[PDB]
Amino acid sequence: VNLRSLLVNPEGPTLMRLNSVQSSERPLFLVHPIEGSTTVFHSLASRLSIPTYGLQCTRAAPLDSIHSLAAYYIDCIRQVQPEGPYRVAGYSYGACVAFEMCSQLQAQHNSLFLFDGSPTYPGCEAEAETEAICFFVQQFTDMEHNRVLEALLPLKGLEERVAAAVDLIIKSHQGLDRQELSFAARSFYYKLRAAEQYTPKAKYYGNVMLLRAKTGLGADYNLSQVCDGKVSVHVIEGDHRTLLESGLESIISIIHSSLA
């Protein structure tokens, strides 16, 4: 169901075309939410008049930091589009990565769309990993925090937690690929770490557009804290998850009307 769309093929391609659009215009690149899949971008892409791609997080992506992750996604991009003027958007967690990407392209005139997300929106390894994976577990099962927390806290480290987690999950959905869950659970922790440890290097002088959800740091998601250029935020109908589904019509118009 909704759960298999929280998993990605660890060996799948990083950059995948999301719609037919044979056009010759510069494409629009969509950066995945924290779960790594470009599934949420399916509706939006199908209803877009420009070629749009998706970036998913597979085993090939370096997660030591948002900086590395962005530099790698930039490389995947330059294969489909070698030239400078880039159009990139990032959903939720992807927002931050998309920001770092355009940010690196700057230091090295691009369009940047943030779908309800932003760069904002050492001895405690154990608790961090436990809470991360504990959370991850709750997305696939019903298990109570405390019961799950009790099973993951005393474990040696990440791989034991991931394994114990994958077991708890399968004991609820036997059909889920254990290799995917295992990769999902582990990268999930690494993605959180990289994000909750990210802080823009310099100020972004480029034009940013925040498409915020209507139903819920102040209608800016702290964008102004890191941007100098034009920061325009549109309020879309729905909450964090429904926004791209019709808050989608609004978004489709806004994106269309922007990119000439």
Coordinates of C-alpha atoms in Angstrom, one line a residue:
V1 CA 0.0 0.0 0.0
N2 CA 1.3 3.4 1.1
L3 CA 4.2 1.5 2.7
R4 CA 5.8 0.3 -0.5
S5 CA 6.0 3.9 -1.5
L6 CA 8.2 4.6 1.6
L7 CA 10.7 2.2 0.2
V8 CA 13.1 2.6 -2.8
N9 CA 15.1 0.1 -4.9
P10 CA 18.6 0.4 -3.3
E11 CA 20.0 -0.5 -6.8
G12 CA 17.5 1.7 -8.7
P13 CA 18.7 4.7 -10.8
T14 CA 19.2 8.1 -9.0
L15 CA 17.8 10.3 -11.7
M16 CA 14.6 9.1 -13.3
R17 CA 12.4 10.8 -15.8
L18 CA 8.9 11.3 -14.3
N19 CA 6.9 12.3 -17.4
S20 CA 6.7 11.9 -21.2
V21 CA 6.9 15.7 -22.2
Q22 CA 9.1 15.6 -25.3
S23 CA 9.7 19.3 -25.0
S24 CA 13.1 21.0 -25.5
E25 CA 12.8 23.2 -22.4
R26 CA 15.2 23.0 -19.4
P27 CA 13.8 20.2 -17.1
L28 CA 12.6 20.5 -13.6
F29 CA 14.3 18.3 -11.0
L30 CA 12.3 17.0 -8.0
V31 CA 14.1 16.1 -4.8
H32 CA 12.5 13.4 -2.7
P33 CA 11.1 13.7 0.8
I34 CA 12.9 11.9 3.7
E35 CA 11.8 8.4 2.6
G36 CA 13.8 8.8 -0.6
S37 CA 11.1 8.0 -3.2
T38 CA 9.8 10.3 -5.9
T39 CA 6.3 8.7 -5.6
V40 CA 4.7 11.8 -4.1
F41 CA 5.8 13.7 -7.3
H42 CA 3.7 11.5 -9.6
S43 CA 0.6 13.6 -9.8
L44 CA 2.4 16.9 -10.2
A45 CA 4.7 15.6 -12.9
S46 CA 2.0 14.0 -15.0
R47 CA 0.2 17.3 -15.1
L48 CA 3.3 19.5 -16.1
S49 CA 4.1 20.9 -19.6
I50 CA 7.9 20.7 -19.1
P51 CA 10.2 17.6 -18.8
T52 CA 10.4 16.8 -15.1
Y53 CA 12.7 14.4 -13.3
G54 CA 12.9 12.8 -9.9
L55 CA 15.9 12.2 -7.6
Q56 CA 15.5 9.3 -5.3
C57 CA 17.9 8.3 -2.5
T58 CA 19.5 4.9 -3.3
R59 CA 22.6 3.2 -2.0
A60 CA 24.7 5.2 -4.4
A61 CA 24.0 8.5 -2.5
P62 CA 26.5 9.6 0.1
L63 CA 24.7 10.5 3.3
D64 CA 27.7 11.8 5.4
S65 CA 26.1 15.2 4.9
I66 CA 23.6 17.3 3.0
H67 CA 26.6 18.9 1.3
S68 CA 27.8 15.6 -0.2
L69 CA 24.3 14.5 -1.0
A70 CA 23.6 17.7 -3.0
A71 CA 27.0 17.6 -4.8
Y72 CA 26.2 14.1 -5.9
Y73 CA 22.7 15.0 -7.1
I74 CA 24.2 17.9 -9.0
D75 CA 26.4 15.4 -10.9
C76 CA 23.4 13.2 -11.7
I77 CA 21.7 16.3 -13.1
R78 CA 24.5 17.5 -15.2
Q79 CA 24.2 14.3 -17.2
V80 CA 20.7 15.1 -18.4
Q81 CA 21.4 18.8 -18.6
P82 CA 25.1 19.9 -18.8
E83 CA 24.3 23.6 -18.8
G84 CA 24.0 26.1 -15.9
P85 CA 20.5 27.5 -15.7
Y86 CA 18.8 24.9 -13.5
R87 CA 15.2 24.4 -12.2
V88 CA 15.1 22.4 -9.0
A89 CA 12.4 21.8 -6.4
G90 CA 12.6 19.8 -3.1
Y91 CA 9.7 18.4 -1.1
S92 CA 9.8 18.6 2.7
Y93 CA 13.3 17.0 3.5
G94 CA 14.0 17.4 -0.2
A95 CA 13.6 21.1 0.2
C96 CA 16.8 21.4 2.3
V97 CA 18.8 19.3 -0.2
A98 CA 17.4 21.2 -3.2
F99 CA 18.5 24.4 -1.4
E100 CA 22.0 23.1 -0.8
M101 CA 22.2 22.1 -4.4
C102 CA 21.3 25.6 -5.9
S103 CA 23.5 26.9 -3.1
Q104 CA 26.5 25.0 -4.4
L105 CA 25.7 25.9 -8.0
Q106 CA 25.8 29.5 -6.8
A107 CA 29.2 29.4 -5.1
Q108 CA 30.4 27.5 -8.3
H109 CA 20.0 32.6 -11.8
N110 CA 18.5 29.2 -11.0
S111 CA 14.9 28.5 -10.0
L112 CA 14.3 27.0 -6.6
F113 CA 10.9 25.7 -5.4
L114 CA 10.5 24.4 -1.8
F115 CA 7.4 22.2 -1.2
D116 CA 6.6 22.9 2.4
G117 CA 10.2 22.6 3.7
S118 CA 13.4 24.5 4.1
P119 CA 17.0 24.3 5.4
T120 CA 15.3 24.6 8.8
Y121 CA 12.0 22.7 8.4
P122 CA 28.4 13.3 20.0
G123 CA 28.0 10.7 22.7
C124 CA 24.3 10.2 22.2
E125 CA 24.5 7.9 19.2
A126 CA 22.4 5.3 20.9
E127 CA 19.4 7.5 21.8
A128 CA 19.5 9.2 18.4
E129 CA 19.6 5.9 16.4
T130 CA 16.9 4.4 18.7
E131 CA 14.5 7.3 18.3
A132 CA 15.1 7.5 14.6
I133 CA 14.6 3.8 13.9
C134 CA 11.8 3.7 16.6
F135 CA 10.0 6.3 14.6
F136 CA 10.7 4.5 11.3
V137 CA 9.2 1.4 12.8
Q138 CA 5.9 3.2 13.7
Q139 CA 5.4 4.2 10.1
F140 CA 5.1 0.5 9.1
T141 CA 3.4 -1.0 12.2
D142 CA 1.1 0.0 15.1
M143 CA 3.5 -0.9 17.9
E144 CA 3.6 1.5 20.9
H145 CA 6.6 3.8 21.2
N146 CA 7.5 2.4 24.6
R147 CA 7.4 -1.3 23.6
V148 CA 9.5 -0.5 20.5
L149 CA 11.8 1.8 22.4
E150 CA 12.4 -1.0 24.9
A151 CA 13.4 -3.4 22.1
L152 CA 15.9 -1.1 20.3
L153 CA 17.5 0.9 23.1
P154 CA 19.8 -1.8 24.6
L155 CA 21.0 -3.0 21.2
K156 CA 24.7 -2.8 20.3
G157 CA 24.3 -0.3 17.5
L158 CA 22.7 0.7 14.2
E159 CA 22.8 -2.6 12.4
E160 CA 21.3 -4.5 15.3
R161 CA 18.6 -1.8 15.6
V162 CA 18.0 -2.0 11.8
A163 CA 17.8 -5.8 11.9
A164 CA 15.5 -5.8 15.0
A165 CA 13.4 -3.2 13.3
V166 CA 13.1 -5.0 10.0
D167 CA 12.0 -8.1 12.0
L168 CA 9.3 -6.2 13.8
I169 CA 8.1 -4.8 10.5
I170 CA 8.0 -8.1 8.6
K171 CA 6.1 -9.6 11.5
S172 CA 3.4 -7.2 10.4
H173 CA 3.8 -7.3 6.6
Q174 CA 5.5 -10.5 5.4
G175 CA 5.5 -9.3 1.8
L176 CA 7.8 -6.3 2.3
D177 CA 11.3 -6.9 0.8
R178 CA 13.6 -7.3 3.8
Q179 CA 16.5 -5.8 1.8
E180 CA 14.6 -2.6 1.1
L181 CA 13.3 -2.2 4.6
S182 CA 16.9 -2.8 5.9
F183 CA 18.2 -0.1 3.5
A184 CA 15.3 2.2 4.3
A185 CA 15.7 2.0 8.1
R186 CA 19.4 2.6 8.0
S187 CA 19.5 5.5 5.5
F188 CA 16.5 7.0 7.4
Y189 CA 18.8 7.5 10.4
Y190 CA 21.6 8.8 8.3
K191 CA 19.3 11.3 6.5
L192 CA 18.0 12.7 9.8
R193 CA 21.5 13.1 11.1
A194 CA 22.8 14.8 8.0
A195 CA 19.8 17.2 8.1
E196 CA 19.7 17.9 11.8
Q197 CA 23.4 18.8 11.4
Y198 CA 23.1 20.9 8.2
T199 CA 23.5 24.7 8.3
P200 CA 23.9 26.7 5.0
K201 CA 27.5 27.8 4.3
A202 CA 26.7 31.2 2.8
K203 CA 23.7 33.4 2.0
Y204 CA 21.6 32.5 -1.1
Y205 CA 21.2 35.5 -3.3
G206 CA 19.0 33.6 -5.7
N207 CA 15.2 33.7 -5.9
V208 CA 13.5 31.2 -3.8
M209 CA 9.8 30.2 -3.8
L210 CA 8.2 28.6 -0.7
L211 CA 5.0 26.7 -1.4
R212 CA 3.8 26.3 2.1
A213 CA 0.9 24.2 3.4
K214 CA -2.1 26.0 4.7
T215 CA -2.9 23.7 7.6
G216 CA -0.1 23.2 10.1
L217 CA 9.2 29.4 11.3
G218 CA 6.7 32.1 10.5
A219 CA 5.1 31.6 7.0
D220 CA 8.7 31.8 5.9
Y221 CA 10.1 28.6 7.4
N222 CA 13.1 30.8 8.3
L223 CA 14.0 31.2 4.7
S224 CA 14.9 34.9 5.2
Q225 CA 17.5 33.8 7.8
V226 CA 19.6 32.3 4.9
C227 CA 18.4 34.2 1.8
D228 CA 19.0 37.7 0.6
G229 CA 17.2 37.7 -2.7
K230 CA 13.5 37.5 -3.4
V231 CA 11.7 35.1 -1.1
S232 CA 8.1 34.6 -2.2
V233 CA 5.8 32.2 -0.3
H234 CA 2.5 30.9 -1.6
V235 CA 0.1 29.2 0.8
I236 CA -1.3 26.0 -0.8
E237 CA -4.5 24.2 0.2
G238 CA -4.0 21.2 2.6
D239 CA -1.5 19.9 5.1
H240 CA 2.1 18.7 4.7
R241 CA 1.1 15.5 2.8
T242 CA -2.1 16.6 0.8
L243 CA -0.5 19.8 -0.4
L244 CA 0.9 18.1 -3.5
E245 CA -2.4 16.3 -4.2
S246 CA -6.5 20.2 -4.8
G247 CA -3.5 22.2 -3.5
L248 CA -1.8 20.5 -6.5
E249 CA -3.7 22.6 -9.1
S250 CA -2.5 25.8 -7.4
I251 CA 1.1 24.5 -7.4
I252 CA 0.8 23.4 -11.0
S253 CA -0.3 26.9 -12.0
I254 CA 2.4 28.7 -9.9
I255 CA 5.2 26.5 -11.3
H256 CA 3.8 26.9 -14.8
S257 CA 3.4 30.7 -14.5
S258 CA 6.9 31.0 -13.1
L259 CA 9.3 29.0 -15.4
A260 CA 8.5 31.1 -18.5

